Write a protein that holds these residues in place. Structure first.
Motif, PDB file in Angstrom:
ATOM      1  N   UNK A  28      50.584  39.777  27.850  1.00 44.98           N
ATOM      2  CA  UNK A  28      51.668  38.965  27.210  1.00 44.98           C
ATOM      3  C   UNK A  28      52.029  37.752  27.605  1.00 44.98           C
ATOM      4  N   UNK A  29      52.075  37.824  28.986  1.00 46.12           N
ATOM      5  CA  UNK A  29      52.755  36.360  29.795  1.00 46.12           C
ATOM      6  C   UNK A  29      52.212  36.698  31.299  1.00 46.12           C
ATOM      7  N   UNK A  30      52.404  35.375  31.749  1.00 42.85           N
ATOM      8  CA  UNK A  30      52.552  35.130  33.583  1.00 42.85           C
ATOM      9  C   UNK A  30      53.562  35.749  33.792  1.00 42.85           C
ATOM     10  N   UNK A  31      53.504  35.573  35.243  1.00 43.53           N
ATOM     11  CA  UNK A  31      54.875  35.764  36.237  1.00 43.53           C
ATOM     12  C   UNK A  31      54.579  35.595  37.408  1.00 43.53           C
ATOM     13  N   UNK A  32      55.736  35.505  38.414  1.00 41.60           N
ATOM     14  CA  UNK A  32      55.418  35.251  39.945  1.00 41.60           C
ATOM     15  C   UNK A  32      56.269  36.248  40.616  1.00 41.60           C
ATOM     16  N   UNK A  33      55.614  36.863  41.715  1.00 40.65           N
ATOM     17  CA  UNK A  33      56.193  37.896  42.558  1.00 40.65           C
ATOM     18  C   UNK A  33      57.183  36.796  43.525  1.00 40.65           C
ATOM     19  N   UNK A  34      58.455  37.180  43.478  1.00 44.14           N
ATOM     20  CA  UNK A  34      59.499  36.371  44.444  1.00 44.14           C
ATOM     21  C   UNK A  34      60.092  37.561  45.309  1.00 44.14           C
TER      22      UNK A  34
END
Length: 238
Positions: A28-34
Motif C-alpha cells: 500500500x505505502x511506505x513508512x518509517x520506524x521511529x
C-alpha cells in the motif's frame, strides 16, 4: 521512485513496506520506524481503510519477493491520523501506526531519528528518497527498494512551481529543476532521509506532487520537524 537505483540490503533500515490484505495482499505505502512500536507514514495512505486489521507492516525488506505467506510481519493496533488532515495537498499528511508487538532492533531494522527544531537552520545537502513505487507515472510496484538523491528546494521556489496550491511551512519540497528524479505512486508515506553530522534524520514524508519527476515540479513532503510535538503527544501512553 523515478530515476533511482537499487538499494543495498539494509542501507535504509528504518524503511518499512505497509501492506493491505484486502482484497488480496499488496503493498500500500511506505513508512518509517521511529520507535519500537511506532511507524510514521502519510495519512492519505489510509483512504478507504476502515480497520487496522487488514494492515501488515514488514521490516527488514529489500525485495517484495521476500514477502510470502510464511513471512513474519507486525500487526497494527491503531491508526492515528492527524485531526486536521483532509487531503494530501492541503497538508497535515501524517499518520502514526501503533504496532501490536514491538520491533526488535537489528542491523536490518532500526529507528530513524526525528529532526531537531534546532536543525531547521541547517542546510541538508545529503537527502535521499526511497521506496517500492512506480518508476514512471503509469507503472507498477517495484520488487527492489529504490533510492534517489534529491536536493531540497526553498519553500519560495516550490511555491513558484505550484501556483494553484498553497505550499506551507509544514511542507518541504525536493527535486531537480530539470526533473528526472522523484518519488512516485507507491512511495507515499516513505521517508525523505537526510544525513547530517553522520546521523540520519527523517526530514520529510513522501506526500504529493504533480505527476512524477516532471520538469519544474518538485515533490512535496510533510515537513516532519513541524510535527515533533504532535508525534510526542500521540505516542505517549494514556
Amino acid at each position: 521512485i523515478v530515476g533511482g537505483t537499487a538499494s543495498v540490503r539494509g542501507e535504509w533500515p528504518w524503511q518499512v513496506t505497509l501492506h493491505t490484505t484486502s482484497p488480496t495482499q499488496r503493498h500500500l505505502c511506505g513508512g518509517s520506524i521511529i520507535g519500537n512500536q511506532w511507524i510514521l507514514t502519510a495519512a492519505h495512505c489510509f483512504y478507504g481503510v476502515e480497520s487496522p486489521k487488514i494492515l501488515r507492516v514488514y521490516s527488514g525488506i529489500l525485495n517484495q519477493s521476500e514477502i510470502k505467506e510464511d513471512t513474519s510481519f507486525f500487526g497494527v493496533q491503531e491508526i492515528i491520523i492527524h485531526d486536521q488532515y483532509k487531503m494530501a495537498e492541503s497538508g497535515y499528511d501524517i499518520a502514526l501506526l501503533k504496532l501490536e508487538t514491538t520491533v526488535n532492533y537489528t542491523d536490518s531494522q532500526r529507528p530513524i531519528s526525528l529532526p531537531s527544531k534546532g536543525e531547521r537552520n541547517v542546510i541538508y545537502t545529503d537527502c535521499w528518497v526511497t521506496g517500492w513505487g512506480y518508476r514512471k507515472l503509469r507503472d507498477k510496484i517495484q520488487n527492489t527498494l529504490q533510492k534517489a538523491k534529491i536536493p531540497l528546494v526553498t519553500n519560495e521556489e516550490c511555491q513558484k512551481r505550484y501556483r494553484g496550491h498553497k505550499i506551507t511551512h509544514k511542507m518541504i519540497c525536493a527535486g531537480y529543476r530539470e526533473g528526472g528524479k522523484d518519488a512516485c505512486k507507491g512511495d507515499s508515506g516513505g521517508p525523505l532521509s537526510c544525513k547530517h553530522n553522520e546521523v540520519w534524520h527523517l526530514v520529510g514524508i513522501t506526500s504529493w506532487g504533480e505527476g512524477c519527476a516532471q520538469r519544474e515540479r518538485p515533490g512535496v513532503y510533510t515537513n516532519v520537524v513541524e510535527y515533533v510535538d504532535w508525534i510526542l503527544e500521540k505516542t505517549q501512553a494514556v
